[PDB]
Write a protein that holds these residues in place. Structure first.
Motif, PDB file in Angstrom:
ATOM      1  N   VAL C  63      32.672  -9.433  66.041  1.00 49.08           N
ATOM      2  CA  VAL C  63      31.777 -10.322  65.309  1.00 49.08           C
ATOM      3  C   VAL C  63      32.478 -11.106  64.213  1.00 49.08           C
ATOM      4  O   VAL C  63      31.847 -11.947  63.577  1.00 49.08           O
ATOM      5  CB  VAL C  63      30.553  -9.580  64.727  1.00 49.08           C
ATOM      6  CG1 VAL C  63      29.705  -9.010  65.857  1.00 49.08           C
ATOM      7  CG2 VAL C  63      30.978  -8.524  63.715  1.00 49.08           C
ATOM      8  N   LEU C  66      31.955 -14.985  63.787  1.00 46.48           N
ATOM      9  CA  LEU C  66      30.673 -15.619  64.078  1.00 46.48           C
ATOM     10  C   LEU C  66      30.330 -16.752  63.118  1.00 46.48           C
ATOM     11  O   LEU C  66      29.664 -17.709  63.528  1.00 46.48           O
ATOM     12  CB  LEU C  66      29.548 -14.591  64.101  1.00 46.48           C
ATOM     13  CG  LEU C  66      29.446 -13.707  65.337  1.00 46.48           C
ATOM     14  CD1 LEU C  66      28.293 -12.710  65.114  1.00 46.48           C
ATOM     15  CD2 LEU C  66      29.257 -14.497  66.632  1.00 46.48           C
ATOM     16  N   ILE C  69      30.697 -20.509  64.104  1.00 48.15           N
ATOM     17  CA  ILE C  69      29.712 -21.267  64.859  1.00 48.15           C
ATOM     18  C   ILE C  69      29.120 -22.388  64.003  1.00 48.15           C
ATOM     19  O   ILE C  69      28.688 -23.418  64.543  1.00 48.15           O
ATOM     20  CB  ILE C  69      28.656 -20.300  65.436  1.00 48.15           C
ATOM     21  CG1 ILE C  69      29.308 -19.448  66.525  1.00 48.15           C
ATOM     22  CG2 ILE C  69      27.449 -21.046  65.969  1.00 48.15           C
ATOM     23  CD1 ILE C  69      28.551 -18.202  66.879  1.00 48.15           C
ATOM     24  N   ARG C  70      29.068 -22.203  62.675  1.00 45.38           N
ATOM     25  CA  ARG C  70      28.704 -23.239  61.708  1.00 45.38           C
ATOM     26  C   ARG C  70      29.912 -23.887  61.032  1.00 45.38           C
ATOM     27  O   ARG C  70      29.959 -25.112  60.870  1.00 45.38           O
ATOM     28  CB  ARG C  70      27.839 -22.625  60.595  1.00 45.38           C
ATOM     29  CG  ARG C  70      26.507 -22.106  61.039  1.00 45.38           C
ATOM     30  CD  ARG C  70      25.462 -23.164  61.091  1.00 45.38           C
ATOM     31  NE  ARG C  70      24.139 -22.554  61.165  1.00 45.38           N
ATOM     32  CZ  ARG C  70      23.395 -22.418  62.259  1.00 45.38           C
ATOM     33  NH1 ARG C  70      23.822 -22.853  63.444  1.00 45.38           N
ATOM     34  NH2 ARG C  70      22.194 -21.834  62.148  1.00 45.38           N
ATOM     35  N   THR C  71      30.889 -23.091  60.577  1.00 48.59           N
ATOM     36  CA  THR C  71      31.945 -23.641  59.725  1.00 48.59           C
ATOM     37  C   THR C  71      33.051 -24.321  60.516  1.00 48.59           C
ATOM     38  O   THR C  71      33.805 -25.113  59.946  1.00 48.59           O
ATOM     39  CB  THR C  71      32.613 -22.568  58.855  1.00 48.59           C
ATOM     40  OG1 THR C  71      33.352 -21.652  59.667  1.00 48.59           O
ATOM     41  CG2 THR C  71      31.610 -21.797  58.022  1.00 48.59           C
ATOM     42  N   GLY C  72      33.178 -24.003  61.797  1.00 49.39           N
ATOM     43  CA  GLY C  72      34.383 -24.284  62.534  1.00 49.39           C
ATOM     44  C   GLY C  72      35.507 -23.331  62.177  1.00 49.39           C
ATOM     45  O   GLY C  72      35.486 -22.633  61.159  1.00 49.39           O
ATOM     46  N   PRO C  75      42.644 -23.953  59.905  1.00 44.08           N
ATOM     47  CA  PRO C  75      43.999 -23.415  60.082  1.00 44.08           C
ATOM     48  C   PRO C  75      44.374 -22.474  58.953  1.00 44.08           C
ATOM     49  O   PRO C  75      44.082 -22.733  57.787  1.00 44.08           O
ATOM     50  CB  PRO C  75      44.892 -24.663  60.056  1.00 44.08           C
ATOM     51  CG  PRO C  75      44.005 -25.807  60.111  1.00 44.08           C
ATOM     52  CD  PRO C  75      42.644 -25.413  59.738  1.00 44.08           C
ATOM     53  N   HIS C  78      45.862 -23.708  55.596  1.00 46.67           N
ATOM     54  CA  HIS C  78      44.892 -24.454  54.806  1.00 46.67           C
ATOM     55  C   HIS C  78      44.013 -23.537  53.959  1.00 46.67           C
ATOM     56  O   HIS C  78      43.467 -23.979  52.940  1.00 46.67           O
ATOM     57  CB  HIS C  78      44.049 -25.278  55.791  1.00 46.67           C
ATOM     58  CG  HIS C  78      42.895 -25.998  55.179  1.00 46.67           C
ATOM     59  ND1 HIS C  78      43.049 -26.934  54.180  1.00 46.67           N
ATOM     60  CD2 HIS C  78      41.569 -25.953  55.456  1.00 46.67           C
ATOM     61  CE1 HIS C  78      41.863 -27.414  53.845  1.00 46.67           C
ATOM     62  NE2 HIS C  78      40.949 -26.842  54.611  1.00 46.67           N
ATOM     63  N   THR C  80      43.715 -21.513  51.381  1.00 44.70           N
ATOM     64  CA  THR C  80      44.252 -21.070  50.109  1.00 44.70           C
ATOM     65  C   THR C  80      43.244 -20.168  49.409  1.00 44.70           C
ATOM     66  O   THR C  80      42.070 -20.105  49.789  1.00 44.70           O
ATOM     67  CB  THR C  80      44.524 -22.291  49.245  1.00 44.70           C
ATOM     68  OG1 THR C  80      43.309 -23.037  49.112  1.00 44.70           O
ATOM     69  CG2 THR C  80      45.579 -23.168  49.893  1.00 44.70           C
ATOM     70  N   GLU C  82      41.532 -20.439  46.660  1.00 47.80           N
ATOM     71  CA  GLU C  82      40.330 -21.108  46.177  1.00 47.80           C
ATOM     72  C   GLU C  82      39.397 -21.478  47.329  1.00 47.80           C
ATOM     73  O   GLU C  82      38.174 -21.320  47.223  1.00 47.80           O
ATOM     74  CB  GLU C  82      40.721 -22.343  45.367  1.00 47.80           C
ATOM     75  CG  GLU C  82      39.561 -23.008  44.654  1.00 47.80           C
ATOM     76  CD  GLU C  82      40.006 -24.157  43.774  1.00 47.80           C
ATOM     77  OE1 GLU C  82      41.222 -24.449  43.745  1.00 47.80           O
ATOM     78  OE2 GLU C  82      39.141 -24.769  43.114  1.00 47.80           O
ATOM     79  N   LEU C  83      39.950 -21.963  48.442  1.00 49.82           N
ATOM     80  CA  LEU C  83      39.105 -22.281  49.591  1.00 49.82           C
ATOM     81  C   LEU C  83      38.514 -21.016  50.198  1.00 49.82           C
ATOM     82  O   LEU C  83      37.340 -21.001  50.590  1.00 49.82           O
ATOM     83  CB  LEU C  83      39.888 -23.071  50.646  1.00 49.82           C
ATOM     84  CG  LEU C  83      39.089 -23.453  51.900  1.00 49.82           C
ATOM     85  CD1 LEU C  83      37.918 -24.374  51.558  1.00 49.82           C
ATOM     86  CD2 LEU C  83      39.986 -24.102  52.940  1.00 49.82           C
ATOM     87  N   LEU C  86      35.438 -19.933  48.241  1.00 49.07           N
ATOM     88  CA  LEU C  86      34.271 -20.735  48.582  1.00 49.07           C
ATOM     89  C   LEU C  86      33.762 -20.381  49.972  1.00 49.07           C
ATOM     90  O   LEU C  86      32.554 -20.219  50.178  1.00 49.07           O
ATOM     91  CB  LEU C  86      34.619 -22.222  48.511  1.00 49.07           C
ATOM     92  CG  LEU C  86      33.407 -23.156  48.504  1.00 49.07           C
ATOM     93  CD1 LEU C  86      32.649 -23.001  47.190  1.00 49.07           C
ATOM     94  CD2 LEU C  86      33.824 -24.603  48.717  1.00 49.07           C
ATOM     95  N   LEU C  87      34.673 -20.233  50.934  1.00 53.88           N
ATOM     96  CA  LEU C  87      34.254 -19.911  52.293  1.00 53.88           C
ATOM     97  C   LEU C  87      33.614 -18.533  52.383  1.00 53.88           C
ATOM     98  O   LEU C  87      32.701 -18.339  53.188  1.00 53.88           O
ATOM     99  CB  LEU C  87      35.437 -20.006  53.255  1.00 53.88           C
ATOM    100  CG  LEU C  87      35.865 -21.423  53.643  1.00 53.88           C
ATOM    101  CD1 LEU C  87      37.144 -21.353  54.466  1.00 53.88           C
ATOM    102  CD2 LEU C  87      34.773 -22.173  54.400  1.00 53.88           C
TER     103      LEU C  87
END
Ligand SMILES: Nc1ncnc2c1ncn2[C@H]1C[C@H](O)[C@@H](COP(=O)(O)OP(=O)(O)OP(=O)(O)O)O1
Ligand SMILES: Nc1ncnc2c1ncn2[C@H]1C[C@H](O)[C@@H](COP(=O)(O)OP(=O)(O)OP(=O)(O)O)O1
Ligand SMILES: Nc1ncnc2c1ncn2[C@H]1C[C@H](O)[C@@H](COP(=O)(O)OP(=O)(O)OP(=O)(O)O)O1
Ligand SMILES: Nc1ncnc2c1ncn2[C@H]1C[C@H](O)[C@@H](COP(=O)(O)OP(=O)(O)OP(=O)(O)O)O1
Ligand SMILES: Nc1ncnc2c1ncn2[C@H]1C[C@H](O)[C@@H](COP(=O)(O)OP(=O)(O)OP(=O)(O)O)O1
Ligand SMILES: Nc1ncnc2c1ncn2[C@H]1C[C@H](O)[C@@H](COP(=O)(O)OP(=O)(O)OP(=O)(O)O)O1
Ligand SMILES: [Li+]
Ligand SMILES: [Li+]
Ligand SMILES: [Li+]
Ligand SMILES: [Li+]
Ligand SMILES: [Li+]
Ligand SMILES: [Li+]
Ligand SMILES: [Li+]
Ligand SMILES: [Li+]
Ligand SMILES: [Li+]
Ligand SMILES: [Li+]
Ligand SMILES: [Li+]
Ligand SMILES: [Li+]
Ligand SMILES: [Zn+2]
Ligand SMILES: [Zn+2]
Ligand SMILES: [Zn+2]
Ligand SMILES: [Zn+2]
Ligand SMILES: [Zn+2]
Ligand SMILES: [Zn+2]
Lengths: 173, 173, 173, 173, 173, 173
Positions: C63, C66, C69-72, C75, C78, C80, C82-83, C86-87
């Motif tokens: 899982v 999963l 399916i929304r976020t894509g 890579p 990419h 980091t 900070e990202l 947020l993710l």
């Protein structure tokens, strides 16, 4: 069960080979049969085989896998003697005309066709196989092709011409 | 013959389905088994089936096609009773652990798994099938799925929930 | 935003990986998660890890992506800190049940899963990567996998078994 | 992080779009940017927009997605205001020259480019999208394109010409 | 015969190159023209060529193959002087605006464009060509590119910079 | 220029059709020639045509596009009388044996082959064409096939049988 319609026979181009091997794209049985036909025509002539033998091999090459429109293509290692016996009976109900051709083929025509059938597969994987398993399969098939040829009823001079042409062809493929 | 190595089991993603049906791309058995697992998990829960039954269906879903790494995937109409008997013995030598799971599955878990196995195929063709034959196969499978479900030991309320969820899902696929 | 429906979860097979790397075909997250699950199962057992740890890694493997399916799929270089922060918040709204599993994973299960997640990617590119950039990515991932493993809480004997199995597997892939 | 080399910029053709949508093949950002450029050129001229505005839109069209060679392409619904802010800073380090062009674009050039960017995506899915989700995305994008255009600073006569040309083009696509 | 509509020009992405060479996927003329444009822009600048020359090469790069939307792409060895003469007249009716640009191009811009046009093809096959024939074509094109450059009106210092950049780029492709 | 080697003739499967039309995958000339051969065989027999005529059509079907291994496949609308004249001379140097067969074909065999050549293309696009242009091409070819047949030397009863079989076949494709 029996294939009787042109719309069904056209689905040769819908039947994918190499179902257990990674390849760059899914080869279909229509392009495979055309290429086997070509090899029978060219290499039968190069080997000096009688015209009637080359013709019989070529005729069978163009239809030999039609039953797969129903059965699917299945991997060579999986086709044990017991499975082949069951499949031969099923295939004879699917395409009785192909079964009749197979039962009429002369041994020399059968051995030409079989050499070319396996050679086409080696040649296909040389370009389009991906990964270590595909590489092993390519080389296994090449060994099997040579062993069958060497043990066949074909004259040694014919065997040598077939191997001469195969090796020239794969180097340029 | 027996599959014993991780490098072999990873070739699930090298095994192509739909070998006699035109599709937009060659679906492999790894993505198929994941999707069947998902359906067992979600729809078994939606139908209120016991946790132990859903778990058993899900466990089988993840491994049920491993023998195809050797045998290839073969078309449903081709799998007659006599061929299935021969294949069951061969498959039990290829993946004895999968054969043991299959022999332990409760009827309710088997029927959940089978419903989801066929539903996944219908759902796949809805998006990725090409041409009239693929369309007919999609609809035939859907009829077969419903008939098997209706004749199964699953309670009618469970059958109805499975069909409710299937129809909602295909509309959005 | 939240994923709640089976028709959405089935789109795992619509989510393409390797969006910045040339490959022979677009691998989806369903086949990826199945393969990671397989590696967790087989290599966790080979390494003698406790059953509860292997089970937890396997459950997460099925899982873990999963939310894509929304976020894509994005890579690795990419992502980091900070990202990723947020993710993580966005992903926890998309798939709260996956976020809960992630927050419950034991360190040893996490390290097994992470080793197998990266190993699967190396193994995939070994067969299906194309060109010099893909080759560099394959080798970078392999170095990153080893460094993470060596610095992890896993016992050295477990680390060595995982590397033993990885190297045997890639040689045959 | 910064993209400085031609070998990197050539990997535009290695960057796949539609990472969460089923399509017939993986469209890359090079073919996308060419098509957006074409639309800016043709439709900017059809709408009678000043040459300097059309030139600016076209120049941006050819480079606007270069940062994706590092970041990947990510789905529109996922790009919320907070993520876009973070991505804008990262993208400005990856391709400072593209960020400078973006910061210099006149509003009318930006709105032409944005109309064409979204139109290209609708046109692509019209031919190459597969399944119900892809169909919904195609239609959602078309609604978003129209709403943005209607609310933009472009004169109504320019808006009408752009919609006239879009509708003629999609009918023939 | 004449191409006049945006819906037709968008079919650049429907026009496949490499029609006689095995490749991993069918490259279209839109991605090809974008990549040639990029090479003209970057390498023209690296070589210190006048801005007006680089601009002219780039402008032609973006449109040079539009006639192929009608004619198809045909293999370089097949384009003999007599066929090229016939095709030039046909192409001038299909895309008169492209023919006018071609007739206005300065020799230095033409040689930059031609170097980049052939370099792009070599670079594409380096990643995506399959088999011995594709390999030979890749190397033949590279030899032809060098011979044309060496015999061109470009200053030797410009020739050397173009080869410097080409060789750095292919090593990393 | 002349094709003399089996390794070259095997590249029939490397020659892509539909170079200006969007399709689900790149059809090669080997699968095309096999399918045309099949149609000649089946429909020539259904129409009661003399065996010698059907044989001649079938023999030509299997080789008719071999020159494309050098020339590439080019779109029908592009083949004007002047281009066809130039191509006929070039093709006669590439494959003199095919040119000799073409020059020996009886009118009735030529018309059977041409009907089947165009029918195969319509049938292929029915399944594998994508978008509005491909749809128009499919229907244009069907109209051209009918007009040529109606104006041919074939007896009306033969024409009617060919159309009867074509329409039955496309309905099931
Ligand atoms: N060692 C192998 N492993 C996996 N696939 C293989 C191997 N050898 C061949 N193949 C593939 C090629 C085809 O897709 C398929 C079966 O080959 P095919 O040419 O139809 O028949 P065959 O020569 O094995 O037997 P038969 O003539 O009895 O039908 O197996
Ligand atoms: N009517 C059909 N025609 C062609 N292909 C079909 C048809 N129905 C299903 N298929 C395909 C889907 C798979 O690729 C393949 C076999 O399906 P699979 O799911 O492995 O097994 P199965 O449900 O038929 O049988 P079993 O459980 O006995 O192995 O046949
Ligand atoms: N160096 C790299 N360059 C390009 N693509 C890469 C690289 N390394 C990995 N990839 C790809 C593989 C996947 O398609 C994608 C992201 O990998 P994925 O397995 O989903 O997550 P991850 O391990 O990077 O991070 P996380 O667990 O935080 O989500 O990046
Ligand atoms: N509703 C949607 N669902 C899924 N994918 C979508 C949707 N709308 C668009 N896409 C895809 C198209 C592209 O592959 C990707 C992002 O589109 P892209 O054209 O690069 O940027 P954008 O217009 O969303 O934003 P920006 O200009 O801020 O980068 O999302
Ligand atoms: N030796 C070769 N064999 C096969 N294909 C080749 C060879 N060299 C190039 N190609 C392919 C690449 C393209 O798909 C196609 C024609 O190339 P293209 O770039 O359009 O034109 P060109 O440079 O040959 O000529 P022109 O500028 O006169 O149109 O031939
Ligand atoms: N209207 C069309 N637009 C685009 N492509 C087309 C059209 N009609 C046919 N095609 C494609 C199909 C093939 O890929 C290609 C040429 O067809 P092909 O079957 O080789 O020859 P042909 O019948 O046109 O002529 P000839 O017998 O003179 O060679 O054009
Ligand atoms: Li395969
Ligand atoms: Li076969
Ligand atoms: Li299939
Ligand atoms: Li199967
Ligand atoms: Li990729
Ligand atoms: Li991912
Ligand atoms: Li996608
Ligand atoms: Li994007
Ligand atoms: Li090609
Ligand atoms: Li071209
Ligand atoms: Li095409
Ligand atoms: Li052709
Ligand atoms: Zn065969
Ligand atoms: Zn299954
Ligand atoms: Zn993962
Ligand atoms: Zn864009
Ligand atoms: Zn070009
Ligand atoms: Zn033809």
């Amino acid at each position: 069960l029996q294939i009787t319609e042109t719309y069904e026979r056209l689905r040769a181009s819908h039947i994918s080979r190499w179902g257990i091997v990674q390849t760059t794209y899914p080869q279909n049985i229509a392009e495979h049969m055309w290429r086997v036909w070509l090899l029978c025509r060219d290499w039968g002539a190069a080997a000096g085989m009688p015209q009637h033998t080359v013709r019989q091999a070529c005729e069978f090459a163009l239809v030999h896998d039609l039953a797969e429109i129903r059965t699917g293509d299945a991997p060579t290692p999986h086709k044990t003697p017991e499975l082949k016996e069951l499949l031969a009976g099923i295939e004879a109900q699917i395409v009785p005309e192909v079964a009749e051709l197979e039962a009429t083929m002369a041994p020399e025509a059968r051995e030409l066709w079989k050499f070319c059938d396996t050679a086409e597969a080696v040649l296909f994987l040389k370009v389009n196989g991906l990964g270590a398993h595909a590489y092993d399969v390519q080389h296994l098939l090449m060994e099997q092709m040579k062993r069958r040829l060497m043990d066949s009823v074909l004259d040694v001079e014919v065997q040598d011409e077939l191997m001469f042409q195969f090796e020239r062809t794969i180097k340029k493929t």
